[PDB]
């Protein structure tokens, strides 16, 4: 066994004033893998976990730039992070 490879194909599907919806694909095979979503304002650091390859980030600041990483995790440990994805919430 070994840590999983990174999540793949990360897309920011929708963005609103206070939410951002994320989509991705499971990592290349290395067992059960879950995910760690780290996001922050790009100008506190937030971290949430998910079992499915989608996440709706909530109660974000309007008209704000965000960075987001996603990591895969199994019972060995976490993958190397995704590349950083940039998105921007809609102004109020």
Author numbering: 291 to 320, 324 to 336, 341 to 389
What text comes from the article?
Recently, a shortened Dscam (sDscam) gene family with tandemly arrayed 5′ cassettes in Chelicerata species has been identified, which encodes ∼50–100 isoforms. Chelicerata sDscams could be classified into two subfamilies, sDscamα and sDscamβ, containing one and two variable Ig domains, respectively. Crystal structures and cell aggregation assays demonstrated that both α and β subfamilies of sDscam used Ig1 for the isoform-specific trans recognition in a hand-in-hand manner. Furthermore, the cis interactions were established by the three FNIII domains of sDscam, which assemble into a cross fold with a kink between FNIII2 and FNIII3.
We found that FNIII2 alone but not FNIII1 or FNIII3 could promote cKIT tyrosine phosphorylation, suggesting the essential role of FNIII2 domain in mediating sDscam cis interactions. The gel-filtration analysis supported our observations in the crystal structures: Ig1 mediated the formation of trans homodimer and all the three FNIII domains were involved in the cis interactions.
